[PDB]
Amino acid sequence: SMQINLNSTDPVPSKTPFSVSDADSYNKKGTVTVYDSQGNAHDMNVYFVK
Amino acid sequence: GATAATFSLSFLNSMQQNTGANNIVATNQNGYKPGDLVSYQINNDGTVVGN
Amino acid sequence: TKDNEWAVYTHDSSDPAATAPTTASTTLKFNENGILESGGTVNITTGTINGATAATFSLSFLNSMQQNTGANNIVATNQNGYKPGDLVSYQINNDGTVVGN
Amino acid sequence: YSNEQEQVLGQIVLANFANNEGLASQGDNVWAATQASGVALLGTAGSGNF
Structure with a gap:
């Protein structure tokens, strides 16, 4: 489970x-x-857009 | 040569009030890497707990 | 040599005239969960010193998990070829058996 | 000696009997071997029965 606080506007x-x-192609x-x-660790990445 | 990480991720309890900027508040998984016993402890309630 | 495959090379340092190992003595194939399925017990026969008799034995890899626990690790290892010894002392245990040390 | 040389004059042997408590006391704090006491079984003081 994962939780994150976001900006409404x-x-x-x-x-x-x-x-x-790209750098500015996402919000977070x-x-x-x-x-x-x-025993190997995978670093899955999550990107948030509107 | 390891199995693909087949997991289910939940995003329940999400709040989007003007709370400043974007920041992550909780992150966990049950994919516990193998570990070895460090010490054993006994509580005041009688249940012996290993670490 | 490759992924999920391990080759074991046995070298006998007891015989000065022993040939240096070239090919793999055995192959250790591990499941995608890190569980062994191939290479349980391997019979290795050594050479001869001072015209003695050649010795043969078996080495078991059972209960061995490769799951990236840091680096190469050994937990337990034993054999059943104890060397000769001399009687140090004797004692009586609580179960009544006579045991020599 | 006076020339940085090492010489050994011998080593004291240990006589460990196979069966103690069968030694008859003699003289002053010495014991004499006899029947029901075993042979001396001499040896060094390194390890083993000594």
């Missing part, structure tokens, strides 16, 4: 195409920590 980015490499950058059956 946060401006939507003007860049319509969504890409990971997050991460997810998981471990597999063999």
Whole structure:
């Protein structure tokens, strides 16, 4: 489970195409920590847009 | 050579009031990496708990 | 050598004339959960010292999980080839058996 | 000696009987071997029965 506080009136980015490499293509950058059956950790990334 | 992380993620209890900016408040998972016993402890309630 | 595959090379340092290992003595195939399925017990026969008799035994990898627990790790290891010894002392245990040390 | 040389004059042997408490007391704080006492079983003081 993950929870995050967001801004109701946060401006939507003007860049319509969504890409990971861009900086202002998202509103918030997050991460997810998981471990597999063999003890390796994968850092899943979560991005929030409007 | 490890299994793909097949997990379910929930976003329940979300609040979006003007609380300043975007910030994460809670993050956890049950994917506990293997660990070894460090010490054993006994509570005042009689239940012995390992660490 | 590759993913989820481990090759074990056995070298006998007791025999000065023992050939250096070249090929893998056995292969250790691990499941995607880090559980072994291949390479349980491997018979390795050593050489001869001073014209003695060759020794053969078996080594077991059972109960071994590769799940990225830091680096290479060994928990428990034992054999059943105890060397000869001399009687140090004797004692009587609570169960009535006579045991020599 | 006066020339930085090491010499050994011998080592004191230990006679560990196989069966104690069968030694007959003699003289002053010495014991004499006899029947029901075993042989001396001499040896060094390194390890083992000594």
